[PDB]
Amino acid sequence: SGLVPRGSHMVRRARCYPTSNATNTCFGSKLPYELSSLDLTDFHTEKELNDKLNDYYALKHVPKCWAAIQPFLCAVFKPKCEKINGEDMVYLPSYEMCRITMEPCRILYNTTFFPKFLRCNETLFPTK
Numbered sequence: 001s002g003l004v005p006r007g008s009h010m011v012r013r014a015r016c017y018p019t020s021n022a023t024n025t026c027f028g029s030k031l032p033y034e035l036s037s038l039d040l041t042d043f044h045t046e047k048e049l050n051d052k053l054n055d056y057y058a059l060k061h062v063p064k065c066w067a068a069i070q071p072f073l074c075a076v077f078k079p080k081c082e083k084i085n086g087e088d089m090v091y092l093p094s095y096e097m098c099r100i101t102m103e104p105c106r107i108l109y110n111t112t113f114f115p116k117f118l119r120c121n122e123t124l125f126p127t128k
Contacts, residue, residue, distance in 0.1 A: 002014065004089060008126060008127060009092050009126040010126055010127070011092070013087050013088065014040065014081065014088065015039045015088065016037050016081045016082075016083070017035060017036055018034060019036045019046075024036065026078055027070070027073060027074065031080070032080065035082070037079055037088075040079040040081075040090050049077055052119075053077065055116045055117060056116070064105070065101060065104045068100045068101040068103060068105065069101055072098065072100055075093040075097050079091055079092070079093075092121070092126045093120060093126065093128075094127060095126055098120045098122060102122070110122050110123050
């Protein structure tokens with residue numbers, strides 16, 4: 001009882017918790033959502049999600065991939081978790097948003113070379 005009857009990875013009845021008093025912020029610009037779904041990740045707490053960021057942060061060295069996860073930096077850690085018809089669901093990242101990183105770093109087409117940093121689905125086609 002936690003998965004909307006739809007096709008392709010797009011939405012699912014996941015969890016949802018209040019991030020900030022008004023609404024979490026990403027790269028200065030505040031997000032349109034004030035909730036978050038830890039289920040979107042494989043962590044066990046908010047601290048874990050924000051902690052993992054440090055790992056990917058190292059990628060800063062590479063501007064090609066760095067700017068690639070700029071827009072996804074929000075759809076990767078702060079997923080748009082809203083309530084559809086009264087059901088707390090999550091909004092997975094679109095193939096495009098995730099493709100932004102594929103452009104610069106194609107070597108990660110679908111290999112376990114940098115999962116901790118990737119943490120993005122590619123083998124499947126979500127297509128928002």
